[PDB]
Amino acid sequence: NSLALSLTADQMVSALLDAEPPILYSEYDPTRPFSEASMMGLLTNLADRELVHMINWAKRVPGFVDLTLHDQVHLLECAWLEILMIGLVWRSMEHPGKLLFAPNLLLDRNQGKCVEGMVEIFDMLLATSSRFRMMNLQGEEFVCLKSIILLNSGVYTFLEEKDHIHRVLDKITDTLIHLMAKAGLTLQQQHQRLAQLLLILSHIRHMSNKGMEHLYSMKCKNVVPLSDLLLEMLDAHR
């Protein structure tokens, strides 16, 4: 059974907001200019650290610890870079033109040209960030979207617990629209806005697919050493 299926819309939000990981810092040294290998080392060092916090966040996502350990593994393998990117995009919402990788690592579109192949991905991230800002994405909605990515991204690549996952995904949809009803939206605007938010997840998935390929190119060319967790995280996608 579970208890996640009987939370109220307000307690779902409350649980998710309380499960949020901390905002981490870069060990960037603002006195030493960038190379392709330094920035990249900086990015994957942060990613590796964010990854361990994400795993403890997922465990706090209502319905998640009900899954088999095998199912939890597969969902995080599928979703990790998406979760990283939706986080980055949200952080960067009120810094137009910039990606806030960490409070002390705020990178301009142009600095992405430091890494080869990186700038086209920067651009997609920035455009997503612009979309968020245009819609005025709220913190309560953000945490819903992020949970939805965790549960949704690997669900179809699996005892029908697909059904349990689908049941809780339904709870997060209700939560999203409750937040929209609460903000004074009409029924028509709630359903339009829900569709808007969900179609962006398609673009987040696109960016993760591309990022995985880039990350893999840097792995092969040994420009940067990646942690063990990152390696294994990257190996799951091939």
Partner: peptide, 10 residues
């Protein structure tokens, strides 16, 4: 024996 596996157990 995945690291992820261990981290989730932990």
């Amino acid at each position: 024996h995945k690291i992820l596996h261990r981290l989730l157990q932990d």
